[PDB]
Design an enzyme around this catalytic site. Structure first.
Site, PDB file in Angstrom:
ATOM      1  N   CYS A 102       3.862   1.293   9.615  1.00  0.00           N
ATOM      2  CA  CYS A 102       3.675   0.242   8.612  1.00  0.00           C
ATOM      3  C   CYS A 102       5.043  -0.228   8.142  1.00  0.00           C
ATOM      4  CB  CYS A 102       2.830   0.752   7.444  1.00  0.00           C
ATOM      5  SG  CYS A 102       1.135   1.010   7.976  1.00  0.00           S
ATOM      6  N   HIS A 128       0.808  -1.212   0.000  1.00  0.00           N
ATOM      7  CA  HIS A 128       0.000   0.000   0.000  1.00  0.00           C
ATOM      8  C   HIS A 128       0.849   1.273   0.000  1.00  0.00           C
ATOM      9  CE1 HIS A 128       0.600   1.057   4.225  1.00  0.00           C
ATOM     10  NE2 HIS A 128       0.102  -0.093   4.644  1.00  0.00           N
ATOM     11  N   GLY A 133       2.794   5.658  10.478  1.00  0.00           N
ATOM     12  CA  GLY A 133       4.148   5.583   9.968  1.00  0.00           C
ATOM     13  C   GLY A 133       4.854   4.317  10.413  1.00  0.00           C
TER      14      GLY A 133
HETATM   15  O1  RFM Z   1      -1.666   7.884   4.821  1.00  0.00           O
HETATM   16  C1  RFM Z   1      -1.349   7.414   3.715  1.00  0.00           C
HETATM   17  N1  RFM Z   1      -1.563   6.031   3.378  1.00  0.00           N
HETATM   18  C2  RFM Z   1      -2.177   5.077   4.216  1.00  0.00           C
HETATM   19  C3  RFM Z   1      -1.784   3.735   4.103  1.00  0.00           C
HETATM   20  C4  RFM Z   1      -2.398   2.772   4.895  1.00  0.00           C
HETATM   21  C5  RFM Z   1      -3.398   3.149   5.769  1.00  0.00           C
HETATM   22  N2  RFM Z   1      -4.094   2.161   6.584  1.00  0.00           N
HETATM   23  C6  RFM Z   1      -5.330   1.582   6.079  1.00  0.00           C
HETATM   24  C7  RFM Z   1      -5.016   0.965   4.706  1.00  0.00           C
HETATM   25  C8  RFM Z   1      -4.336  -0.370   4.457  1.00  0.00           C
HETATM   26  C9  RFM Z   1      -4.199  -0.593   3.037  1.00  0.00           C
HETATM   27  S1  RFM Z   1      -4.813   0.663   2.205  1.00  0.00           S
HETATM   28  C10 RFM Z   1      -5.311   1.590   3.409  1.00  0.00           C
HETATM   29  C11 RFM Z   1      -3.556   1.760   7.846  1.00  0.00           C
HETATM   30  O2  RFM Z   1      -4.167   0.940   8.527  1.00  0.00           O
HETATM   31  C12 RFM Z   1      -2.246   2.389   8.309  1.00  0.00           C
HETATM   32  N3  RFM Z   1      -1.985   2.051   9.669  1.00  0.00           N
HETATM   33  N4  RFM Z   1      -1.340   0.948  10.110  1.00  0.00           N
HETATM   34  N5  RFM Z   1      -1.286   1.008  11.440  1.00  0.00           N
HETATM   35  C13 RFM Z   1      -1.912   2.180  11.890  1.00  0.00           C
HETATM   36  C14 RFM Z   1      -2.141   2.733  13.169  1.00  0.00           C
HETATM   37  C15 RFM Z   1      -2.824   3.966  13.276  1.00  0.00           C
HETATM   38  C16 RFM Z   1      -3.268   4.636  12.118  1.00  0.00           C
HETATM   39  C17 RFM Z   1      -3.041   4.087  10.855  1.00  0.00           C
HETATM   40  C18 RFM Z   1      -2.350   2.844  10.748  1.00  0.00           C
HETATM   41  C19 RFM Z   1      -3.811   4.462   5.862  1.00  0.00           C
HETATM   42  C20 RFM Z   1      -3.179   5.438   5.063  1.00  0.00           C
HETATM   43  C21 RFM Z   1      -0.694   8.291   2.638  1.00  0.00           C
HETATM   44  C22 RFM Z   1       0.026   9.454   2.981  1.00  0.00           C
HETATM   45  C23 RFM Z   1       0.620  10.242   1.945  1.00  0.00           C
HETATM   46  C24 RFM Z   1       0.483   9.859   0.605  1.00  0.00           C
HETATM   47  C25 RFM Z   1      -0.229   8.704   0.265  1.00  0.00           C
HETATM   48  C26 RFM Z   1      -0.826   7.911   1.306  1.00  0.00           C
END
Ligand code: RFM
Ligand code: RFM
Lengths: 306, 306
Positions: free
Chosen positions: B148, B41, B146
Site C-alpha cells: 500500500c 487507512h 505492505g
Molecule cells: O493489516 C493492517 N491494515 C490493513 C489495511 C488495509 C487493508 N486492505 C483492505 C482495506 C482498505 C481500507 S481499510 C481496509 C487492503 O486491501 C490492503 N491491501 N492492498 N493490497 C493488498 C494485496 C494483498 C493483501 C492486502 C492488500 C488490509 C489491512 C494492519 C496491520 C497492523 C495494524 C493495523 C492494521
C-alpha cells in the site's frame, strides 16, 4: 496477490548509462568506475557489417575516435584514454570514474534465468522490461539498432549484478548479447550474416512455478489426480521441446504450500500442451515459462485458499 | 523489432519513496518537496478495518503519531509538522524538502490507459511493472498488503506524471488505488468489505493496436479481406463485452503504415474472439488489450513487412 512480469528498479543502472559514438555509428555504453563498455560493432562501418575484421578496425581507431557523453543527470563529456577488445565488447578506459558507480558484480546467466533489461537509446534510458534467457540462449525483447548497449541486470541486497549487454537482433523479436566478460550468449557471432538458431524449448521448471503461482492465486481447474513420474516426463520432454525437469527445494515448498504434487503439475503440463480446452490460466491460454521459482516466490505468500 | 510490456525507468520515482508508520501499521509514502502522501487507512486499527471512522481517526492522531523515514539513498528521519485528509489519502507536511524531487504533475487516467507502477515494501522500491486501467477502473497488478502506498506514474518530457497510489486488493489479482486528488479509481471505498465490481470489458482500441503491432512484426495470418463497419462492430461489442471503437489519429497512422484497414481489424477481432484456431499472435492465444496505441507506437518504427 496477482502475477505480473516485474523488473528490478532501474535507478542505479540509469546513473551508469552513456552515449558512445564512433564515426557515424552511435549506441549505448555502461560507465562503471573508469571504464565504459559497449559492443565492439560500434567500430564497424556500414559497408563491412557482413565481414568485420575487428582486429584491423581496433587499431585503425585512435582514442579520439570514440566520443563518450553522459546526457542524463550530471552531464559530461568523457575523455577516452585507452581502448581494447574484451571478446565482443569494446572496453574504453576513460579519465574519470563514475561517481555513481553502484556496488556491482558481473555474472553469466544460464538458460531459464530471468533478468531485467534497461532499454536505452542514444545514451538515454527509455524503458524497463524483464526477459528470460531462452534454451537456445537468445532473449525475446524489444530493441532497435540504436538500442545496442542496453543493459541486463539483476539486483540483490543493494548489489547490481550485470549480466547482459545488447548486441544484435537475430530474427523478428529475437535478440542476443554478451555477458561483460565479452562472451556472446549462445552460438552467435557479431556479424551481419544469417545464423541458424538451435531449437528453443519450454523451460519446464519455470512452467511448474507458474502453475503453482496460479494455484495460489485461486486458479486450479487444471490440477487433476493424474500424475506422471519424472522419468516418464523427461522422456516425453525430449520429443516435445520441453527441458528435462530436475526438482528444487523452492519447488518442493510450493508443492507443500498448495498440497499439489510435482508429479501432478508435470501431468498438467502434458495435458495443457495438448490444449487449454477454451480455458485460461492467470489470463493466458498458453504455457508461461519466463517466471522462475524465485520470481514466483517474490509475488506469493498468500495462504493457499480453496 | 519485438513487443514487450515496457515500463518507464523508475529512478526518478525511487528517490521519492519513504516509509510511513502510524501505530503498528506501516506502508509506503511518496515524498515530494515538503509533502508526504500515503493512504489514509494507515490510521486504522486492525479491528476497525470494516467500518473506519476516518474523521475521528484523524482527530485522534497527532503529528507525532506519524513516523516517516527514508531508508534508501540519502537516509533521513522526517519530522511531520502537519497532517490533513485528501479524499482517501493523508497529506503529511514534513520539515525537509526532498532534495531529489523531480519535475512532476498529477493526473487521473481513464479506463484503457497504461501506466508504470513502482512496487514498494516498507519504504523500499522492490519492483517495476506496467498495468492498464480496466473498464471497471480496477487494475490487474501484483501487490501484497505492505505494498500500500506503491506509486503509479508515466513520463512526459523529463516530467513525472503521478497517477496512482495503491490502496487495496479487491479480489485475487484485482486492485485499486487513488489518484493524488485523493479520488479512488472506480466505485470503491477504502474499507474491508466485499464490494461489487462492475463487469470488465476488452478495450477494443488497444486490441486493435496490438493487432497492428503484430502485423508490423510479421504476424499476419489473422488478416483477411473481410471487413466490418464501425457502427456494426459497436452493436456487436455491446453484447460481447468489448468497448465501443472510436477512431484516433494514432490508429489511423498504424492502418496507413500497415495497409490494413481498421474495419479489417475489427473483423479479425470478431473472429479471434470465437477462437484462435490453434494459432498464436505474438506468442499468445488470447486477445491482448493492455497495449495502448501510443505504447505500440513507441515500440514500432521498423520499416515495411509483407
Ligand atoms: O493489516 C493492517 N491494515 C490493513 C489495511 C488495509 C487493508 N486492505 C483492505 C482495506 C482498505 C481500507 S481499510 C481496509 C487492503 O486491501 C490492503 N491491501 N492492498 N493490497 C493488498 C494485496 C494483498 C493483501 C492486502 C492488500 C488490509 C489491512 C494492519 C496491520 C497492523 C495494524 C493495523 C492494521
Ligand atoms: O547500422 C549500423 N551498424 C550496425 C551494427 C549492428 C547491426 N546488427 C547486426 C550486426 C552485429 C555485428 S555486425 C552487424 C544488429 O543486429 C543491430 N541490432 N541490434 N538490435 C537490433 C534491433 C533492430 C534492428 C537492428 C538491431 C546492424 C548495423 C551503422 C550505422 C552507421 C555507421 C556504421 C554502422
Amino acid at each position: 496477490s496477482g502475477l505480473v512480469k516485474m523488473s528490478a528498479p532501474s535507478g542505479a543502472v540509469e546513473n551508469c548509462i552513456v552515449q558512445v559514438t564512433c564515426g557515424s555509428m552511435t549506441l549505448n555504453g555502461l560507465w562503471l568506475d573508469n571504464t565504459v563498455w559497449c559492443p565492439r560493432h560500434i567500430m564497424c562501418p556500414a559497408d563491412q557489417l557482413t565481414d568485420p575484421n575487428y582486429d584491423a578496425l581496433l587499431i585503425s581507431k585512435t582514442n579520439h575516435s570514440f566520443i563518450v557523453q553522459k546526457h542524463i543527470g550530471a552531464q559530461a563529456n568523457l575523455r577516452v584514454v585507452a581502448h581494447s577488445m574484451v571478446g565482443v565488447l569494446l572496453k574504453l578506459t576513460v579519465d574519470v570514474a563514475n561517481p555513481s558507480t553502484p556496488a556491482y558484480t558481473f555474472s553469466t546467466v544460464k538458460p531459464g534465468a530471468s533478468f531485467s533489461v534497461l532499454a536505452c537509446y542514444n545514451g538515454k534510458p527509455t524503458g524497463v522490461f524483464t526477459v528470460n534467457l531462452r534454451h537456445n540462449s537468445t532473449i525475446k525483447g524489444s530493441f532497435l539498432c540504436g538500442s545496442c548497449g542496453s543493459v541486463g541486470y539483476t539486483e540483490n541486497g543493494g548489489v547490481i549484478n550485470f549480466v547482459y549487454m545488447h548486441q544484435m537482433e537475430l530474427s523478428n523479436g529475437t535478440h542476443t548479447g554478451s555477458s561483460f566478460d565479452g562472451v556472446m550468449y549462445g552460438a552467435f557471432e557479431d556479424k551481419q550474416t544469417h545464423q541458424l538458431q538451435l531449437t528453443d524449448k519450454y523451460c519446464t521448471i519455470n512452467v511448474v512455478a507458474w502453475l503453482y503461482a496460479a494455484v495460489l492465486n485461486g486458479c486450479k481447474w487444471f490440477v487433476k489426480p493424474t500424475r506422471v513420474g519424472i522419468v516418464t516426463y523427461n522422456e516425453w520432454a525430449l520429443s516435445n521441446q520441453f527441458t528435462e525437469f530436475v526438482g528444487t527445494q523452492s519447488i518442493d515448498m510450493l508443492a507443500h504450500r498448495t498440497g499439489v504434487s510435482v508429479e501432478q503439475m508435470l501431468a498438467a503440463i502434458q495435458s495443457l500442451h495438448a490444449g487449454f480446452q477454451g480455458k485460461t490460466i492467470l489470463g493466458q491460454s498458453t504455457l508461461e515459462d519466463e517466471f522462475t521459482p524465485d520470481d514466483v516466490n517474490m509475488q506469493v505468500m498468500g495462504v493457499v485458499m480453496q
